[PDB]
Amino acid sequence: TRNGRDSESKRLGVKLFGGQAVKAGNILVRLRGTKFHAGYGVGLGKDHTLFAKVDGVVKFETKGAFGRKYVSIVAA
Amino acid sequence: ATVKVTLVKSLNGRLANHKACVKGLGLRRINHTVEVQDTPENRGMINKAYYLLRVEG
RNA sequence: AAUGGGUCAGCGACUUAUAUUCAGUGGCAAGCUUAACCGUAUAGGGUAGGCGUAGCGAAAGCGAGUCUUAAUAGGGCGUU
RNA sequence: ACCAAACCGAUGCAAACUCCGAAUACCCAGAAGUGCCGAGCAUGGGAGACACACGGCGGGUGCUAACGUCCGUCGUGAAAAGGGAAACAACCCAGACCGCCAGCUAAGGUCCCAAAGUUGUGGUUAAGUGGUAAACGAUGUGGGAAGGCUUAGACAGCUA
RNA sequence: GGGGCUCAAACCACACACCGAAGCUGCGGGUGUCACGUAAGUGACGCGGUAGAGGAGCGUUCUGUAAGCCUGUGAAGGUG
RNA sequence: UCCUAAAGAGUAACGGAGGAGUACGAAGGUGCGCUCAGACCGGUCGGAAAUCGGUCGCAGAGUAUAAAGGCAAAAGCGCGCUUGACUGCGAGACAGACACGUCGAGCAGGUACGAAAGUAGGUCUUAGUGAUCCGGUGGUUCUGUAUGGAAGGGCCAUCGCUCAACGGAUAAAAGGUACUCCGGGGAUAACAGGCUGAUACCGCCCAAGAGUUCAUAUCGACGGCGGUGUUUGGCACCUCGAUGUCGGCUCAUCACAUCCUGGGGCUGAAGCCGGUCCCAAGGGUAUGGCUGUUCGCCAUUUAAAGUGGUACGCGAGCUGG
RNA sequence: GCUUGACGAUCAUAGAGCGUUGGAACCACCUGAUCCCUUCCCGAACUCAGAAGUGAAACGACGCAUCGCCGAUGGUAGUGUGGGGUCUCCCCAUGUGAGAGUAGGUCAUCGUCAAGC
């Protein structure tokens, strides 16, 4: 019945938007279960964190079947 | 190729963006007139702060 | 229509000591500086000690390196 | 002759619904000019603050009550005088370096207190409405669209 | 807000003129910063402010300067 | 975990909803394989239902657990092997006051599976937790107060327990004050004032109805719109370097929503009476028994014993029940 | 220059449905399971050896817009900024601008390699 109780608001979402230069370890998307999928040179960590495996710029392409949003890094 | 603007209203309660536009045109106080080049990026600051200015040409 | 003061004239509130840090300003400079104390005594002497000239490591230690490490790999701190 | 999930069609609604989906704001890159000569960053020396208020907008709570209260975001006051709103932190205009018996303006104003139009053209309004206000009620009056009843003689009033 | 206002001194339009601020401009001063300048030397942008930071001064008493200088031809104080 | 949250983050309330203080040696790893659920129609124990044969199917199933977000390379499901639920680290980011926290390519050493590319530093993801100081235990290259050892200490790994007020005052922590005291505060309650009007009070709009007929002579259900600040509230704006209660007495003053007296209209007003509604504020408008009473109930009067505002008028005017 | 395979680009204007058509090469179905291998029980999947038959199933190509899915223009709602009002809401200037629906589309378009014509 009685009612308080929130939690500490985990700061999720898109870091490193769609034209930005990335280094080879940077967190792309903090994610709660794959909104965005792992593209060309990006990694998919344990808690579905997208991180960069190479350098370049972020792409954010909507590719393929299943309508999936991909974060990929184009070496440019 | 050159447009002249006159600041005819005050800055004293304006949004910080609009008064940044007026400052970026080179205007310092009321009835002050500059001659600025008519680049499209000067006309953006003229158009954002349109209500404070007097844009003759 | 909150406090305080009737008024005047006197008085009445960031000090001092010792350690230290930063700035400014001087002296000496890979060195600088003395404390007690001695002193015909603000001089001169007294360099014990303090800080600097090297760091790393919890330490032994090793040292322009050192620690961790199975590692001459990585990484931390350091080095005209 | 009771009652009937479900599908078919029509019809709505949500902060904890979404097949959709902005404006903005946010992040990055490249550019002109402006910056009061800087703005940003970094390292140090000294702080103060860590009870905010009200207004506009976007919300929760309340009774879409309170000069209630909790958030977001702008603005002002705090810590800002001046002019306007009669008087009136926070509303409008505008940010006071000093002097002037000079001028032009902003908000707001121009019959007299009181500075400036008893200004001009065309209207509306008779309540002192302006200069306090709701459901609803009124041949109040101005305007603009439309219907049929409209001289074979209509709408209320005299000679079967 | 009051007097008072009714072809308005109210309302809805439109026009032209005026008043109105410590706003702007003119004229005369002072100040900060920056850039220039054999350092006269001008320019340009500034200059509301509480807590608070920073900068530069006045005055009082004492000591040195000072066995100086002033002062009974008149000190300090007091009052114009 | 969702909303509030304003389409990046973040964001409050004694705001709205739910959860956690764990499980698991497989519910982990890997290789290989496989899709769920639902209607249908099928009566000789179940009859809508179990076991299957799936035609349509068309993610609605499942996921250890709340919610949200994700899942075909399924992250769901089955089987075979198995320990990577490794050691040393760690480029670089996310988060962020700090302490904490989150993700992680790659390199070395050794291993799982797989023919091999490769995957594997636990689990679909985010909760499942606790600092330091004390102690305990196992190592150790270190130290080891003359020396050789020990003792004790250090580093490395680990346990406790209790800090659930969960950034943890101490190993160890209940009350009374009307006998009270001090320092502050109108940062904050009681009185009265102030903002509001839920509530209260007074009017009005429609009129089902009753009034023997007839809605409007009188009421008037269901609903609606307001006025006044009249009183119970809500707020905490003034007052805590003091604005001293309720009632009575004494003295009042205004309003009008009029109790009497005055003037009317309608009537379901024959007349005496009335009912209701307008207009009117000039003057009047009880004494007592009870109780501290305001009020109230009675008794007896009057033409009538009005309703309210004034710090619920009035204690530098009295009383003090 | 087309047909059949394999692999991709792209994920419905590419789908689903309905109809016609394909066998010689290819692929599918097919024959049999001695032998590899397999069935929480399999030669119906997985696997091997095939070459008698069939294009029925499946798959492919061509048709059709009824279904699904795309989808204008215009308007409307929202909304940044500035100003108003009778301010729990709208209006004006200016910039922007949907979702839905309407007209209309769509029975895909590409590339590499290999056999055939």
From TrEMBL, chain A:
<keyword id="KW-0689">Ribosomal protein</keyword>
<dbReference type="Pfam" id="PF01016">
    <property type="entry name" value="Ribosomal_L27"/>
</dbReference>
<dbReference type="GO" id="GO:0003735">
    <property type="term" value="F:structural constituent of ribosome"/>
</dbReference>
<dbReference type="GO" id="GO:1902626">
    <property type="term" value="P:assembly of large subunit precursor of preribosome"/>
</dbReference>
<comment type="similarity">
    <text>Belongs to the bacterial ribosomal protein bL27 family.</text>
</comment>
<dbReference type="GO" id="GO:0043022">
    <property type="term" value="F:ribosome binding"/>
</dbReference>
<dbReference type="InterPro" id="IPR001684">
    <property type="entry name" value="Ribosomal_bL27"/>
</dbReference>
<dbReference type="GO" id="GO:0022625">
    <property type="term" value="C:cytosolic large ribosomal subunit"/>
</dbReference>
<dbReference type="GO" id="GO:0006412">
    <property type="term" value="P:translation"/>
</dbReference>
<protein>
    <recommendedName>
        <fullName>Large ribosomal subunit protein bL27</fullName>
    </recommendedName>
</protein>
<keyword id="KW-0687">Ribonucleoprotein</keyword>
<dbReference type="InterPro" id="IPR018261">
    <property type="entry name" value="Ribosomal_bL27_CS"/>
</dbReference>
Automatic annotation (TrEMBL), chain B:
<comment type="similarity">
    <text>Belongs to the universal ribosomal protein uL30 family.</text>
</comment>
<keyword id="KW-0689">Ribosomal protein</keyword>
<dbReference type="GO" id="GO:0022625">
    <property type="term" value="C:cytosolic large ribosomal subunit"/>
</dbReference>
<comment type="subunit">
    <text>Part of the 50S ribosomal subunit.</text>
</comment>
<keyword id="KW-0687">Ribonucleoprotein</keyword>
<dbReference type="InterPro" id="IPR005996">
    <property type="entry name" value="Ribosomal_uL30_bac-type"/>
</dbReference>
<dbReference type="GO" id="GO:0006412">
    <property type="term" value="P:translation"/>
</dbReference>
<feature type="domain" description="Large ribosomal subunit protein uL30-like ferredoxin-like fold">
    <location>
        <begin position="3"/>
        <end position="52"/>
    </location>
</feature>
<protein>
    <recommendedName>
        <fullName>Large ribosomal subunit protein uL30</fullName>
    </recommendedName>
</protein>
<dbReference type="InterPro" id="IPR036919">
    <property type="entry name" value="Ribo_uL30_ferredoxin-like_sf"/>
</dbReference>
<dbReference type="Pfam" id="PF00327">
    <property type="entry name" value="Ribosomal_L30"/>
</dbReference>
<dbReference type="InterPro" id="IPR016082">
    <property type="entry name" value="Ribosomal_uL30_ferredoxin-like"/>
</dbReference>
<dbReference type="GO" id="GO:0003735">
    <property type="term" value="F:structural constituent of ribosome"/>
</dbReference>
